[PDB]
Write a protein that binds this ligand. Structure first.
Ligand SMILES: *C(=O)CCCCCCCCCCCCC
Ligand SMILES: *C(=O)CCCCCCCCCCCCC
Lengths: 41, 604, 72, 72, 604, 41
């Protein structure tokens, strides 16, 4: 967790972070991208 | 563009650093690309439809326009300052976080509202199959109505709002055509809000149904790429993971499985009996290894599983040899010095551990079922672990009896309780088993036509064979499903094979009088039953002695055919037997028209 | 031709990669953010499946991706 | 400061990497040729080991590499 | 810049593609960066020096200026169009390929020329040690010359060109100062072409010798990073490769090594004798396994090597028990059913293969050396291979006797020829052995203080122990060499350890009366002998029961100290005992001055 | 050896290539780059 500083806009051990799940926003990237023949073109 | 919108925090000059997610009091504006508006519009569209029922029941709050949750900001919109710099969008349409919240909880709140009514409308709608699939068929409206006026149970919602539900309905069922006000007659055409979608689902007589035939293909294509049917007979080490073995616990009946028919099970084929002893819970019992060969589960070549030998309904002759009664049946390991199948007498058996005994002798576990006392269904059960048997060259799991006192009566009995239905469940998928060894990778092509009739049915839960069977089985349902391997249509599947048989039978004819020009009508037909026999019983392709199917070419061939075959089906694949299929649909509409005719008379 | 929706995919695919920007620099791999506008072009002509039907799709300065690009 | 000879090394090191240019593109890894002139700068001042001795090395527009760069 | 020079083939605009290696009729101009001119100048400089001898002997061809092989082209110079674009060099100095050829074969041709003369100059120069290392010391020139006028053998080249070699010499030996022409006296200072280099090699009295102390450090630094001394007691699997095991074939004396002192060697500890038989080359012989325990090389836990059991000089009592004579000594494998150390009688021994017999009985292999007939040095020898013993749970290599007829005489003999010096040589480095198992990775920290006194000396050639010994041994020479672990200087090595002992003894004092405040003068001294005992016998750190050295901290600690210790030595590390070292050098120059004094008298 | 074409200035199966060692040019890249503390600076 050693301080970095600019590489990325947020420090991990940074001031006032906060792990806190909300039933409201179910974390998700993009897995189901459609590529099948008919659907991709 | 896509992602959240950014703007030059440093002003004017927007470089790959003078940007910053334009956040604020509303959250962060995320761009609403063209297609993502199709969804939220398609979702809201399906809610607006229920407009007449929202007013009737004073809920709702007016029609939900998607243009109430968005905005018209402008800036650079990407996933990160760097890439957002290449998407300068002006007056794009973004939806702020706090908004992405309402368009969400609104579509959710309204979705409940309608989901309910929409359920009442249905128990009444489908309650008179408003859907036929060949030609038409009416049912004089008066009757129809005066009829449902009955059936519909007193707690629907189609009785409290008839033409408040009817107006919602007219937009979902192009069956109900409302009578035009200024000519007081129907319309021929039916205009339900789902105008196009409903047009493209009708079972078009030319080819089954585009919506069907289309999916049955994309569906198969999914599998073909997914599980990894491709590469099905690849000749080279493959991690068991590549076979996604899951929910895989097969059960048997040893003490029957020949030792050569399945490496994981050796037998004590010795002349006389081998009565040994062991102090178990104080009391001294005698393991028997009776008259017959007593096939025992070998421990090596036994992927740390959960062996659960069930002993039930199986005979328990404590009636004759009284010797048998009193002995608590129990699964016991047996470490032998000299390798089994070379272990002659008691002094040979190193030690014997009762890995799991059954409390209470053999005269409480019984239950008379017509003379022949059976075994009250009970499950003895070890939890074998790869390394608990480290070093130990010879050790065998045996579900025997543990007699408290061997006698002359039990001199031809042989108390192996293995005749029971044992159920091994691999508890550690990563490691498989093949030909008696534990491995981490299979070599597919090796397991083809390498097992015998029963060197397959005797496979051990999650072993190459059982894996190279679970695999073919998927590929077997892709062909069975998508491809027409069940009609005289010499399909892409049975076609990939025919080309192999030719190229094969053709070179076997090269050199020597070549008195036989390849056949073809006979080859097409031979490969048709070959591809067909596969779809039928996927397994066979593992058994030595199966015509065509077991030559190295096929399968590796088949799949890669079936492969490209699915990636071209078109959409109208349903044209196959779309004639009798059609004629059968007209058959149904003629019988359903017959129904409407009674609804039409009984309730005039 | 790269019709509207087919850009949604390649953008949605690249979008999911750009996301990992902070890890690409950290580990000196990658090579900057991948803009889909680096594989396309702005040609113009008639775009169809066959001369006959392509004649009814005069597109001006549409966004097409050349084969060798559809490769990268 | 990046004295003459110390540039020989970092150039000799990068030179041995640029060599593999044809394999970096082929396999879409890498990120273009690594020029040592991308990690340095052209500052100017006095460069020594301590104020006292750095005073006798007035260098103008010398080529220095900043710490965070000496990192990349 | 570096590499070959490129130029815009497309002209003017030089982009990352409009470039191209500017090749031509001369080859390709490669840039000659500043430092690379230092070499070719330093090489040519050392040749020009011999100018006076080139003219004298009409060879050579004038002084070689490096400016005769280069050119002054200009363009972009890189390793590839892409990167060469960022090195626009104007009128740089490049050397064309065909030139890079001459500057090469010239420096080579001339190098021979001088290498020869330069050898004659030497047998004459060093033939009067022109190098002292403390204070000065002359030797009146007349004598000196009139002296070498003798010694020098008639085929030198310093007699055919005295002051044609002398002029070359004056530039290499700042000892010979030529008398100035216009004052006819020396110069005090000596001006040899190697002015600086020769100044920086003199053994400076402040600190031994910069050229020495400097290298002895960079040398150690090389090793420290190289072999991988760092990570020497790492606690985690490490590929044997990480230990670069080479030239590693250790030899023993089994039939002496206790079975528990080295897993790779079990013994037949059975009551009576176990005479077995075997038809070898027709004739039937009897392997004995005589009276004593007969320790045999186990086959499992035996990395497919090249076992070569030598049987020589060892007693061969065919004199007493005549039974022994006639039997051809031979290394033989022995597969037993029941595990050895449980193998009682003959029926237990599955089979016996004569993997390598010695032609001619035991009465031709003998040789009387004072009554006690010995064994004419001969090497029996198998080539054990991991898998040739697959499945086979029990099998042992035994260098026994193969008696052609067992008798009462050989009833207390026990013909194990294992007392001979066996030499196993791992023939497949990738696989190591530990505690009796064959592996592909070691866990260093595990092998520390885990062997016993002799569970080390009994290690098996290329086994963890022998690897975790070959490793410490390097690290042992880095400290022994660079660091001063052999004087009261509480060096960086014995210092890293002291800090561990403190932190260790300090917490063991925490909780309870803490009646003993840590010592330190006693801790420094205890850790000094700990670091010292290590440099001494690197091995010890493997034996259970060694003070300090075997606690998990140390070593892992030591090395990482010694590590940074080398990366800071400075240059004047030689200041250590640079006093007596200096006083010893003056001692030599005083004795060498004594020599010059005789050269000065005898040959006046 | 399938034809490529531009990726790199030379085809492998290209026209008139020629394996032919010359005692004169002992093939060698750059392994012994000096980096030790004193020598790198
Ligand atoms: C410093 O690296 C101390 C360790 C703190 C974070 C390490 C990784 C565990 C937390 C993950 C944060 C990022 C997403 C999980
Ligand atoms: C096509 O790839 C056929 C194989 C010919 C070359 C493959 C690799 C063997 C020759 C190496 C050439 C590059 C340096 C060895």
């Amino acid at each position: 967790g050693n301080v970095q500083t600019s590489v990325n806009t947020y420090n991990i051990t940074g001031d006032g972070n906060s792990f806190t799940p909300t039933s409201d926003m179910t974390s998700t990237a993009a897995p189901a991208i459609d590529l099948k023949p008919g659907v991709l073109n | 563009p896509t992602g959240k919108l950014w703007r030059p925090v440093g002003t004017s000059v927007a470089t790959i650093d003078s940007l910053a997610i334009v956040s604020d009091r509303f959250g962060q504006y995320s761009f609403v690309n063209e297609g993502m508006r199709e969804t939220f519009s398609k979702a809201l569209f399906d809610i607006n439809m229920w407009q007449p029922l929202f007013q009737a029941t004073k809920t709702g709050c007016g029609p939900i326009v998607l243009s109430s949750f968005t905005t018209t900001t402008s800036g650079y919109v990407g996933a990160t300052a760097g890439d957002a710099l290449d998407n300068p969008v002006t007056n794009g349409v973004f939806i702020s976080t706090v908004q992405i919240m309402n368009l969400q909880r609104t579509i959710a709140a309204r979705m409940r509202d309608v989901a309910l009514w929409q359920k009442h409308l249905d128990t009444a709608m489908t309650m008179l199959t408003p859907d036929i699939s060949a030609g038409s068929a009416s049912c004089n409206w008066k009757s129809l109505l005066a009829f449902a006026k009955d059936i519909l149970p007193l707690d629907n919602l189609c009785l409290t709002y008839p033409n408040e539900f009817y107006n919602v309905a007219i937009h979902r069922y192009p069956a109900l055509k409302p009578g035009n006000p200024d000519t007081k007659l129907p319309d021929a055409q039916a205009h339900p809000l789902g105008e196009v979608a409903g047009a493209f689902n009708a079972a078009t007589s030319e080819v089954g149904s585009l919506v069907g035939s289309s999916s049955t293909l994309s569906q198969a294509i999914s599998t073909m790429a997914g599980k990894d049917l491709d590469l099905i007979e690849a000749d080279t080490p493959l991690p068991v993971s590549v076979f996604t073995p899951s929910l895989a616990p097969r059960s048997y009946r040893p003490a029957f499985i020949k030792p050569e028919d399945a490496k994981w099970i050796a037998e004590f084929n010795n002349s006389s009996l081998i009565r040994k002893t062991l102090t178990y819970s104080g009391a001294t019992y005698t393991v028997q290894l009776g008259p017959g060969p007593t096939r025992v589960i070998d421990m090596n070549a036994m992927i740390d599983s959960v062996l659960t030998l069930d002993v039930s309904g199986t005979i328990l002759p404590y009636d004759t040899n009284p010797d048998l009664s009193t002995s608590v049946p129990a699964f016991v390991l047996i470490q032998t010095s000299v390798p089994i199948q070379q272990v002659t007498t008691a002094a040979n058996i190193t030690a014997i551990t009762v890995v799991s005994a059954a409390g209470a002798s053999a005269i409480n576990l019984a239950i008379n079922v017509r003379g022949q006392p059976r075994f009250n269904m009970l499950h003895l059960q070890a939890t074998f672990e790869r390394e608990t048997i480290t070093g130990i060259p010879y050790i065998y799991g045996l579900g025997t009896f543990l007699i408290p006192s061997p006698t002359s009566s039990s001199n031809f009995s042989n108390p192996t309780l293995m005749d029971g239905l044992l159920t091994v469940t691999p508890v550690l998928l990563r490691e498989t088993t093949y030909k008696g060894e534990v491995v981490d990778a299979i070599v597919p092509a090796t397991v083809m036509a390498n097992q015998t009739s029963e060197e397959v049915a005797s496979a051990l839960a999650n072993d190459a064979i059982v894996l190279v069977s679970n695999h073919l089985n998927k590929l077997a349902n892709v062909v069975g499903d998508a491809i027409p391997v069940a009609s005289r249509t010499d399909d892409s599947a049975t076609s990939a094979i025919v080309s192999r048989l030719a190229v094969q039978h053709k070179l076997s004819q090269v050199g020597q009088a070549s008195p036989t020009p390849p056949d073809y009508p006979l080859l097409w037909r031979r490969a048709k039953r070959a591809a067909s026999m596969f779809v039928s019983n996927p397994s066979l392709a593992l058994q030595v002695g199966i015509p065509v199917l077991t030559q190295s070419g096929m399968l590796s061939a088949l799949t890669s055919g079936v492969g490209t075959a699915l990636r071209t089906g078109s959409l109208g694949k349903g044209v196959t037997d779309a004639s009798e299929k059609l004629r059968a649909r007209q058959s149904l509409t003629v019988a359903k028209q017959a129904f409407f005719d009674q609804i039409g008379s009984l309730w005039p």
